[PDB]
Design a binder for this molecule. Sequence first.
Ligand SMILES: NC(=O)c1ccc[n+]([C@@H]2O[C@H](COP(=O)([O-])OP(=O)(O)OC[C@H]3O[C@@H](n4cnc5c(N)ncnc54)[C@H](O)[C@@H]3O)[C@@H](O)[C@H]2O)c1
Ligand SMILES: NC(=O)c1ccc[n+]([C@@H]2O[C@H](COP(=O)([O-])OP(=O)(O)OC[C@H]3O[C@@H](n4cnc5c(N)ncnc54)[C@H](O)[C@@H]3O)[C@@H](O)[C@H]2O)c1
Ligand SMILES: NC(=O)c1ccc[n+]([C@@H]2O[C@H](COP(=O)([O-])OP(=O)(O)OC[C@H]3O[C@@H](n4cnc5c(N)ncnc54)[C@H](O)[C@@H]3O)[C@@H](O)[C@H]2O)c1
Ligand SMILES: NC(=O)c1ccc[n+]([C@@H]2O[C@H](COP(=O)([O-])OP(=O)(O)OC[C@H]3O[C@@H](n4cnc5c(N)ncnc54)[C@H](O)[C@@H]3O)[C@@H](O)[C@H]2O)c1
Ligand SMILES: O=C(Nc1ccc2nc(N3CCOCC3)sc2c1)c1ccc(CN2C(=O)C=NC2=O)cc1
Ligand SMILES: O=C(Nc1ccc2nc(N3CCOCC3)sc2c1)c1ccc(CN2C(=O)C=NC2=O)cc1
Ligand SMILES: O=C(Nc1ccc2nc(N3CCOCC3)sc2c1)c1ccc(CN2C(=O)C=NC2=O)cc1
Ligand SMILES: O=C(Nc1ccc2nc(N3CCOCC3)sc2c1)c1ccc(CN2C(=O)C=NC2=O)cc1
Lengths: 428, 429, 428, 428
Amino acid sequence: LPYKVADIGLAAWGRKALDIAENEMPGLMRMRERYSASKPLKGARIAGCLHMTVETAVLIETLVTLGAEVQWSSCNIFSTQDHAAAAIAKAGIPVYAWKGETDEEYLWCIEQTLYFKDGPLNMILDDGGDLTNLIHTKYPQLLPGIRGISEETTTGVHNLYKMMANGILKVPAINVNDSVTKSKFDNLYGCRESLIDGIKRATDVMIAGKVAVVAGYGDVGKGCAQALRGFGARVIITEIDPINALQAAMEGYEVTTMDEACQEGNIFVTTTGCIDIILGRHFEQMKDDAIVCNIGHFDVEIDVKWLNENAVEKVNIKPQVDRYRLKNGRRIILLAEGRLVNLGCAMGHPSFVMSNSFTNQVMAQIELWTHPDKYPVGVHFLPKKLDEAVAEAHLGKLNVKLTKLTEKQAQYLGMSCDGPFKPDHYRY
Amino acid sequence: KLPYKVADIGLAAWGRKALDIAENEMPGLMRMRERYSASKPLKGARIAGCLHMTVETAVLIETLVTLGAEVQWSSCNIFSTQDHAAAAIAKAGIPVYAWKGETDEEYLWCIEQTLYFKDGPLNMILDDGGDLTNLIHTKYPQLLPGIRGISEETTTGVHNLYKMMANGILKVPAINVNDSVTKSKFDNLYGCRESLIDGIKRATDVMIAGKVAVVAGYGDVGKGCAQALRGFGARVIITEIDPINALQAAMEGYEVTTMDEACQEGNIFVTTTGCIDIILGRHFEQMKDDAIVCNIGHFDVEIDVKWLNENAVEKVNIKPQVDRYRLKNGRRIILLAEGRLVNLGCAMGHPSFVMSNSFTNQVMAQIELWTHPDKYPVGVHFLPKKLDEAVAEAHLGKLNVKLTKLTEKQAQYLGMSCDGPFKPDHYRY
Amino acid sequence: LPYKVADIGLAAWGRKALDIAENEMPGLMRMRERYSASKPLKGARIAGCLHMTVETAVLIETLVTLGAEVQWSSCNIFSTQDHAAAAIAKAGIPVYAWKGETDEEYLWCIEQTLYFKDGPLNMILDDGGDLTNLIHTKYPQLLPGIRGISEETTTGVHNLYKMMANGILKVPAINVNDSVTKSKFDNLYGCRESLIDGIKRATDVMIAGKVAVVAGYGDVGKGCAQALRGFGARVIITEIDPINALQAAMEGYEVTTMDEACQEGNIFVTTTGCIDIILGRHFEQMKDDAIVCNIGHFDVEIDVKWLNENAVEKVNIKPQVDRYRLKNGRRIILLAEGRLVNLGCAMGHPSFVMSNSFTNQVMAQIELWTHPDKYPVGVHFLPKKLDEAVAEAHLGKLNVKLTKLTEKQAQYLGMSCDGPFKPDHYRY
Amino acid sequence: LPYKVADIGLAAWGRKALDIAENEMPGLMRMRERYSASKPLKGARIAGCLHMTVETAVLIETLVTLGAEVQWSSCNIFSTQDHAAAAIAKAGIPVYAWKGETDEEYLWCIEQTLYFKDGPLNMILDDGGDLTNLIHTKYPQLLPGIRGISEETTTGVHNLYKMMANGILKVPAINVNDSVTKSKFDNLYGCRESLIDGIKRATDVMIAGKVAVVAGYGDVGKGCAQALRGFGARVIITEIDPINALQAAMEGYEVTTMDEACQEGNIFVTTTGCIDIILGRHFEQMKDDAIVCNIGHFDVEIDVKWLNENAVEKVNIKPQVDRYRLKNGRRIILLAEGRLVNLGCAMGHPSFVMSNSFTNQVMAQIELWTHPDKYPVGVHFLPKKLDEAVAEAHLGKLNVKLTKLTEKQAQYLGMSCDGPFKPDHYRY
Ligand SMILES: NC(=O)c1ccc[n+]([C@@H]2O[C@H](COP(=O)([O-])OP(=O)(O)OC[C@H]3O[C@@H](n4cnc5c(N)ncnc54)[C@H](O)[C@@H]3O)[C@@H](O)[C@H]2O)c1
Ligand SMILES: NC(=O)c1ccc[n+]([C@@H]2O[C@H](COP(=O)([O-])OP(=O)(O)OC[C@H]3O[C@@H](n4cnc5c(N)ncnc54)[C@H](O)[C@@H]3O)[C@@H](O)[C@H]2O)c1
Ligand SMILES: NC(=O)c1ccc[n+]([C@@H]2O[C@H](COP(=O)([O-])OP(=O)(O)OC[C@H]3O[C@@H](n4cnc5c(N)ncnc54)[C@H](O)[C@@H]3O)[C@@H](O)[C@H]2O)c1
Ligand SMILES: NC(=O)c1ccc[n+]([C@@H]2O[C@H](COP(=O)([O-])OP(=O)(O)OC[C@H]3O[C@@H](n4cnc5c(N)ncnc54)[C@H](O)[C@@H]3O)[C@@H](O)[C@H]2O)c1
Ligand SMILES: O=C(Nc1ccc2nc(N3CCOCC3)sc2c1)c1ccc(CN2C(=O)C=NC2=O)cc1
Ligand SMILES: O=C(Nc1ccc2nc(N3CCOCC3)sc2c1)c1ccc(CN2C(=O)C=NC2=O)cc1
Ligand SMILES: O=C(Nc1ccc2nc(N3CCOCC3)sc2c1)c1ccc(CN2C(=O)C=NC2=O)cc1
Ligand SMILES: O=C(Nc1ccc2nc(N3CCOCC3)sc2c1)c1ccc(CN2C(=O)C=NC2=O)cc1
């Protein structure tokens, strides 16, 4: 089996989508402009485990343009876009991914990416840690032949630190999740674009003139709060961290508890990454047809089980939109069954966000592959200069003219005119 | 003869579900039910309505019925009906003649069925766009003495009403509700603010932040569009022919220049002028690759779509109402809704709460015309300010707004009534 | 007497401040550019009565440039800037004004302006209606030889409408006050600009993170609320008009009563134009060191008398800043003794704001004088095409490039390509 | 000599200002609430070198309230508010500082703080490193008796790493400058409040409708841009960092070069911390009466020397406001001679900002004095849990209600419910 896709005939529709996405992903296209001649990944045999979307197809074809051998599988059973996968298969690349895999087929799809034309993998590009854990626990014989790992997920990086503390990790790993360019686009800018899009497709509701309660004021909360405020909603924040709580107050947001705010809100958005945020006792105080949704962590934040078990009516309105009637006579509108509203009720992040994340991945691959004896086994942050480079790559598309330091200004500032321009502890 | 005519009356239960959701978002119409269902002030009325047969309009329809009126209904556009909403109205025993995908002949037919009731011909006209008003004057001028009032809510329709008075054709009193504060601001500003981006997003899924968005026009639509784009992190450039409107944009920090200049800078183009020849061939040729171009102003006149069709070397349809043209220079143009209204072509229009402000405006006008025959001679009138205010007050509860009441002493000082109106007719808000 | 000033040897300083203020008043300078050669006012003896400031000094010299004889007095006792007064006296213009006049001297100064070198006044330019009221009641002989009045005050136009209601107005007038370009700048943009300057100079207080309660959401309220919000304050609104209240809600502001909001606010700002807004029972509920000020109508909005009568301490911190201690042991910081904070604690509106108000005046003078057989004896709004021309005059300074309607476009729209562009009911 | 102040008779005025400041400095009043009974600084002989302002005077009396003996001097010759220094003098606290000191007097004043009644100092509270530099060079005898150093300045902290690298630092030190609660208030929020205050007092110019060029988009630039945008100015950013350039772009600011931007701007503000930002080449292109000022680094950013050397006129308008006429006949308005505009033309940061920086200082002292063993000789960041504590201390004043994690939630998140809540790399 050279690949496995749902329908190869969808390749043409995929290529048209790719062509449109390329123009919103200038960071990846910049890497093609810079590195297509020199091919810094010639020799590399990269196994990738990452959502097989249109955006990811741009990543895959960028890596190939840089000289690498690439074989791919999706890191989720439902997230694949079949036409994107088809387009990649038609271009010769071994890709094992389709929408609605079984749990057995998911494991099998990863298995087909380990050995290549010219022997086993020597690089891992990862999103969730599933490819990394499969090698270590099942195929540890292959570990010495692997030069490096890239990982861009919070779960995956926590897992990498765990493997290092337990002495299990045997390959140097670059964490790109904590890049400024990755984190700000994935957490803040991304959710700022897509939140209200999810709410609108689901409900078509008037945002302006409503009280909106956002639980959490981290990067995701900041983003959501800014989007809602922009439409003319009155935004109330809840926070546990007094620093984040202070930030909110300094922008003019009311900051209070969910115990208080549940009587106020017309819309509730959870962004905490934490369990037990919206509970039965909160639901019972809510205004009629209050909209409740999550954009934070999987499905743990809203007590959905409570609604199923305590409501008198549950009525499906349209896909991923349920309207529960309670014992008190009032209604709750739940979106995406408590799951991520931006993926359940909308299309997730825009292409431009994904460009920042995936450009970080490309940087990490080059850095590990081109500099073998520069990273010992262990989890490493992406160097700042490469993080800056990711940002630089996107400035052209953003109509931005960057100023260059003069030799004299550099000397005064005690930094190189090429970077990095900030110390490692700098918060931006 | 036919008691109603609609695509599929089996969709009525789905209709009722949508009505129930939207009723909560339409407190204006629902407060009308609260205070006038007892007294039934439209009793003995027989209202022929011509208005898009939607969920919102269904709530309008039933509010008219709740207040004692007899109602018969047709849509004012051939594609704008929601069949489930029309089914729900048909299941409730109301003569509705409407479906999505009508012929120009079926459209005319649908309106003709609403003129005669069992107890006699129409008493009142509720209109959007003038077509019901135009049919009775052209073709059924016998009925004109029987008709007590007209409500009209469209710019097109109000202009037409003023043209008919100038020539002495209009034989019925009419209330222009289009120029109400509560109507104009919701329909022009707040509505477009909410739905522009919904249109753009559903069509393209594009990142709005970090883009130059060129907004032609800074009227109320323009102001809303500009504000919406700005809030996403787009750099909004504006074009204007009116120095006051141009000055307003400058005072909010927007760059104001010409389309001749701005066509080189913009990633997104949005027309809001209500005027022809806004975006043109010479502009298209200057644009960046994959410049998203759309319209939220007047029907399809603002963008020269005919130019694109005649001059592009490729035209590929990406999805419904989204076309990607390739030009002779090898660069591409993404056009939304074929130059038609992007918020209605690529999304579902305005939210229920916007529509509530407009439709409560209609209900106010009807009661006023029916209850007070001697008060309005033949001609075009604005809705009185005190009724405009009542529309706004009817939505304050929903908005968690506690309104202050003037003390007797304060009202004497200010020289107004404590119940209003609170502003003179020239006041601009 | 040719003039009367405090010190005519302050004219160097005056001319310097004029030269600065001319650049920020392009509306008046555009009038000099268009009209200095044609002198449309040639034969106009204009008797003015308006605050004798650097700003107004520019207006005075623009009228002269446009070919008019002009004689001036101040419409207020304290508002005259003496260096500006000096400079106008030096250029051979009869100006009778200084800072700290008596009520008797005030009436005398205005009486001197009525009689020119060549006879009685041809025109009236007025702010507050005092010059208009003087000639009707005290000098009824001069009415037939005066072609028109320009008025730019809420006070003044109401008095003009009262005079016309009762039949004691024998000369036609232009109401400039309800021009878009006057109203927006004087009410909205000006107060947005100068409220916070007023508060800061008085207190130096942090705005961000405070609850700021703004009574009234008219043009002043909107200005004040937008400014406070921009600094990161949580703005609460009070209103009696449901339309205005709806507007505030649609921008995300909380809207509640003063009876409720007095327990919340760190800063109170009154803009209603109405009596009995902030009262003793509101003062008793306020947080410690609540700042209370007025930017609306004179001194009727806040019950300052109550504080004087009921406080246990009254300390002056600095000029126009009083700190009261109440029986409950809590403190109130009152700005400007309940007078206008922007004029009491700061310099009032910027020059650019004033340029829009006075260019409206200049237009009114040209319109009445150049068209005698057009305006019959009454109160009129400045024509829209002239309101438009005020705005146009400032666009150059704003770096604005105005589009011109092609003839084909103007036909479609059924208007002229020179205007007016909007109907008379249009609200902007 | 017990103290040396300009005039002790200004202490009733000072106490009055002190009483106002206290209510805006909840951080320091919360430290007085918690620790006034326990007396954690009991025994501590603190020598502080820091601007002798009303704000600092609260910090001083907070340290005394915590059971410390404190001797004080200013860290700048002009920054003392004499009336504040008199209040601290009358409270019986040895303070040696006045407005307008000589460089020999400045030194003298710091030398008077080293020696108390009971003996020599145990602790150093510092701003700019001049107390710390004096003792190591000129009083190394006192080094072993000194338990800890607090320091809150970029200059002062860069200096500790220069000392530590060369083995001369022989006292443990806490860097408080890079705390979240210090950095955000001193840099971003502070300048957001005070920039425009500076420009207004100097010029009274309309901000709305103008192009404003902000050089730099760091914390200072971010604040300055946000403030200008809030008034209705069109803001243009210049940047050398692609990440910060990207951040500006994502909020809809234009990002171009000064070489291009100099032809556009009505207002210019420099925030880079870098030399050669505004130059003669730029000045020659500027619009007539461009307002140019600096809020970044001292007087290096704007080539003020060029203006003095190449302009045909230089005219003082008022203190710290100079208006040059250039060879091309156009005018430039320089503010504060290119020095910090917020301190040159206004009062600097509000009391509430300063509360965050000086509460950091209190936290630093307790942590050093009560835990000597914990800190080896070196430069240490302030621990996060204390940074959090600073923020928590201000929430009460802000009307903020912080949520507390349940035991179950804390367990799920792998953190204590008392904190810290974020890892050390977290950027807020
Ligand atoms: N939906 C998406 O597409 C998407 C995108 C990026 C990240 N995320 C996820 O969203 C979550 C948040 O990400 P982030 O970057 O904002 O994290 P963050 O650490 O920046 O912010 C989370 C905030 O929630 C607060 N918090 C924790 N428990 C709380 C409680 N019980 N009540 C109130 N506040 C509480 C914390 O103080 C913290 O400030 C994560 O789980 C992340 O994986 C989702
Ligand atoms: N999409 C929708 O659902 C929807 C909703 C409401 C209104 N509208 C329509 O939108 C249009 C605009 O409505 P409005 O209330 O903002 O009108 P408006 O009069 O308030 O504003 C239109 C503006 O366009 C400007 N303009 C005209 N020609 C121009 C040109 N060639 N270049 C630049 N500017 C120009 C005018 O100066 C004016 O300020 C109307 O056709 C209206 O019917 C659409
Ligand atoms: N400070 C200045 O230099 C300056 C500048 C311009 C205007 N003004 C003055 O400020 C005042 C307001 O001007 P405006 O143009 O906003 O008038 P406006 O009529 O547009 O607005 C006043 C608002 O106050 C509301 N109001 C009245 N009584 C109220 C009450 N008891 N509680 C709450 N709201 C109440 C009204 O509903 C109205 O919307 C006027 O007196 C005007 O003369 C002052
Ligand atoms: N006036 C005040 O009260 C006050 C308060 C705090 C800090 N500061 C000072 O302000 C300055 C900046 O502080 P910060 O916290 O913003 O530092 P920062 O590092 O966060 O910001 C400085 C920014 O300027 C940019 N920059 C450097 N050289 C440049 C050039 N030639 N052109 C354009 N941009 C350039 C950098 O990319 C950087 O992002 C420092 O000198 C600091 O001491 C002043
Ligand atoms: O995880 C992702 N998508 C996902 C997974 C499961 C799922 N299950 C659903 N339902 C279906 C109806 O029945 C109930 C369960 S919807 C759904 C969506 C996912 C994450 C990041 C990117 C990254 N990304 C973008 O955001 C845009 N391009 C990208 O690559 C994609 C998908
Ligand atoms: O007009 C509406 N809708 C519409 C949709 C498609 C369409 N397609 C057309 N054709 C043209 C000829 O070529 C082919 C395509 S015309 C047309 C019209 C419409 C307006 C107001 C409200 C009012 N409204 C809201 O906005 C929300 N609820 C409402 O009732 C509805 C629909
Ligand atoms: O009315 C104006 N100024 C004014 C009047 C009286 C007054 N009384 C005071 N106190 C002092 C202490 O004892 C008690 C009385 S302070 C004060 C200030 C006034 C209005 C518009 C413009 C128009 N204007 C601007 O706003 C800017 N340039 C202008 O021309 C000016 C002043
Ligand atoms: O350095 C400070 N202020 C200062 C220094 C010198 C100076 N020189 C001037 N001119 C005068 C006319 O001739 C030319 C020289 S004005 C001026 C002002 C300084 C810093 C932080 C805080 C800390 N701070 C605040 O920011 C607010 N409260 C505070 O404690 C204070 C002052």
